[PDB]
C-alpha cells in the first residue's frame, strides 16, 4: 500500500488545504471567494436591463461551472475527510452521520440545483447562502466565535446602552410628535415620528422628515444631544474591548510554556489510569496538581501567583532558620 500511502498522503495534504488555511496555501479559499464574488457581480449587473444576452450567457456559464465545481468540491471534501485509511471515510461517516453542518449543505445544494434546473429571488438568495457556505471557514464561526465572546463579556453594559437608548428614542419621538403634529405634515402619525427618531438618533439624518416649529426644534436638539451618544456606545464598547483583548493576547502568549506541563499531565493521567485505594487517592491528587499546572502556564497564572510563592518561600526560610535556631540552642547555645 506504499503507492496507496503516497496517494493518500497527497490526499490528506489537499484535505488540509481545503480545510485548514495556512500562510500561503489559501489559493483554494481565495478562488472560491472570487467565484462567489463574480457571480454576485453579474447578479448586480443584472436588473439594470443588461440581461438581454451578454449578462444571460454569463449567468448560464457561471451557473454551469459553479454547480460543477461545488459538486466535485463536496466529493473531494468527503473523500479526503480523514487520513490515508480508516479516517478517510470511516471517521467521515463518524462525523457526518449526525452533524448540523454536514448534510445540510448537501440539502441546500441539491434543492437549489433542483429549483434552477428541474426570479431574481431564487438566484440571489441562493448566492448569499453560498457566502454563508464560505462562512463555513473555521467551523462556520471563527469570526462568530470571536464576536460572540466579546459581546457576551460586555453583556450587562451593552444592555444598559441599548435600553437607555431605546427609552430616549420612544420618549423623544413622542414629545416631538406632539410638538409637530398640527403644523408639520411629516409627523402625520406616531409611527412617522418613530421613523424620524430612528433616523435622527442614529445620525443618519435623511432629511425627509424634519421639525419645523421652534418648540419641536428645541426638543429635537436636546434629545439628539442626549441620545446620539447612547446609540454610538455599542461601537465604542466593542472596539475598546477588542483592543484590550488583543493587548492581553500579547501578554499571555508571551508565556505559553507548556512543553513540560503537557508531558507531565499525560504522565500523571497514565499513571493514574494504570493503577487499575489509598495509593490510587494519591495518584488522583497528583493528577489534579498536574492538570492545574498545565492550565496555569497558558493563562491562569496571575499576579497573585507571584506573591503566592513569595509567602511560601519565606515560610520555608522561616522554617529552616527556626530549626537552625533550636539546633544551635541544643548544641552550641
Amino acid at each position: 500500500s506504499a503507492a496507496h500511502k503516497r496517494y493518500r498522503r497527497l490526499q490528506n495534504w489537499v484535505y488540509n488545504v481545503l480545510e485548514r488555511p495556512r500562510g500561503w496555501a489559501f489559493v483554494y479559499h481565495v478562488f472560491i471567494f472570487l467565484l462567489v464574488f463574480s457571480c454576485l457581480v453579474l447578479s448586480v449587473l443584472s436588473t439594470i436591463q443588461e440581461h438581454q444576452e451578454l449578462a444571460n450567457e454569463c449567468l448560464l456559464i457561471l451557473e454551469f461551472v459553479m454547480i460543477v465545481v461545488f459538486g466535485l468540491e463536496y466529493i473531494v471534501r468527503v473523500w479526503s475527510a480523514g487520513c490515508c485509511c480508516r479516517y478517510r471515510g470511516w471517521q467521515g461517516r463518524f462525523r457526518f452521520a449526525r452533524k448540523p453542518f454536514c448534510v445540510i449543505d448537501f440539502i441546500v445544494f441539491v434543492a437549489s440545483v433542483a429549483v434552477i434546473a428541474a426570479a431574481t429571488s431564487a438566484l440571489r438568495s441562493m448566492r448569499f447562502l453560498q457566502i454563508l457556505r464560505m462562512v463555513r471557514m473555521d467551523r462556520r464561526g471563527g469570526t462568530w466565535k470571536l464576536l460572540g465572546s466579546v459581546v457576551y463579556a460586555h453583556s450587562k453594559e451593552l444592555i444598559t446602552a441599548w435600553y437607555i437608548g431605546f427609552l430616549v428614542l420612544i420618549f423623544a419621538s413622542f414629545l416631538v410628535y406632539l410638538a409637530e403634529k398640527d403644523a408639520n405634515s411629516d409627523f402625520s402619525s406616531y409611527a412617522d415620528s418613530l421613523w424620524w427618531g430612528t433616523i435622527t438618533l442614529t445620525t443618519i439624518g435623511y432629511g425627509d422628515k424634519t421639525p419645523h416649529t421652534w418648540l419641536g426644534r428645541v426638543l429635537a436638539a436636546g434629545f439628539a444631544l442626549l441620545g446620539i451618544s447612547f446609540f454610538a456606545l455599542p461601537a465604542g464598547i466593542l472596539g475598546s474591548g477588542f483592543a484590550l483583548k488583543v493587548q492581553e493576547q500579547h501578554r499571555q502568549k508571551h508565556f505559553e510554556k507548556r512543553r513540560m506541563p503537557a508531558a507531565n499531565l499525560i504522565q500523571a493521567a497514565w499513571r493514574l489510569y494504570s493503577t487499575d485505594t489509598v495509593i490510587r487517592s494519591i495518584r488522583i491528587l497528583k493528577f489534579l496538581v498536574a492538570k492545574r499546572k498545565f492550565k496555569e502556564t497558558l493563562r491562569p497564572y496571575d499576579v497573585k501567583d507571584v506573591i503566592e510563592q513569595y509567602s511560601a518561600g519565606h515560610l520555608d526560610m522561616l522554617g529552616r532558620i527556626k530549626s537552625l535556631q533550636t539546633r544551635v540552642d541544643q548544641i552550641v547555645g
Binding site: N16, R86, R258, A269, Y273, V278
Partner: protein
C-alpha cells in the same frame, strides 16, 4: 458500599478520627509506602480539593475526588489539549516514536517498562501513528 470503601481509605490518613487530612496525615501515609513528597508538594495536593482553604481535606472533598477520578469533561479536554501540544499536523495523530520520546525525556519521565505498557495499550496503527483522542477517552471512561 463504594462510599464505605472510600471512608475506610480516608480513615488510614485520618487515623485519629478528626475528620480531616492535613499535610501530616497525607505525607505520613505516603512516606510509609516509600514516597518522598516535599512539604510544598503536600500543600499543593491538599489545596486542589480544599474548598474551605484551611489546609485540610474532609471526607466530602475526599469522596468527591475519588468518585470523579478523571471522568469529568474538564479532564478529558485538558488531557486532549496536552497531546495537541505535540501534534503539529493538527490531525489528531502522534507517532509512537514521538510519544515514546516525550514520555521518557520530558517531565516526570516514564520508565521504559511504563512507556512500553502505554504504547501497548494504545491501539497503534500499522504505520506507527497513535490516535490520541481515543486514547484520551479510554483514560476518561
Amino acid at each position: 458500599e463504594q462510599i464505605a470503601e472510600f471512608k475506610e481509605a480516608f480513615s488510614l490518613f485520618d487515623k485519629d478520627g478528626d475528620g480531616t487530612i492535613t499535610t501530616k496525615e497525607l505525607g505520613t501515609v505516603m512516606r510509609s509506602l516509600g514516597q518522598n513528597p516535599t512539604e510544598a508538594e503536600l500543600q499543593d495536593m491538599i489545596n486542589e480539593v480544599d474548598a474551605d482553604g484551611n489546609g485540610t481535606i474532609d471526607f466530602p472533598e475526599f469522596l468527591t475526588m475519588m468518585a470523579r477520578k478523571m471522568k469529568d469533561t474538564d479532564s478529558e479536554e485538558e488531557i486532549r489539549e496536552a497531546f495537541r501540544v505535540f501534534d503539529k499536523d493538527g490531525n489528531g495523530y502522534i507517532s509512537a516514536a514521538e510519544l515514546r520520546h516525550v514520555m521518557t525525556n520530558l517531565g516526570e519521565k516514564l520508565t521504559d517498562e511504563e512507556v512500553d505498557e502505554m504504547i501497548r495499550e494504545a491501539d497503534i496503527d500499522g504505520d506507527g501513528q497513535v490516535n490520541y483522542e481515543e486514547f484520551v477517552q479510554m483514560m476518561t471512561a
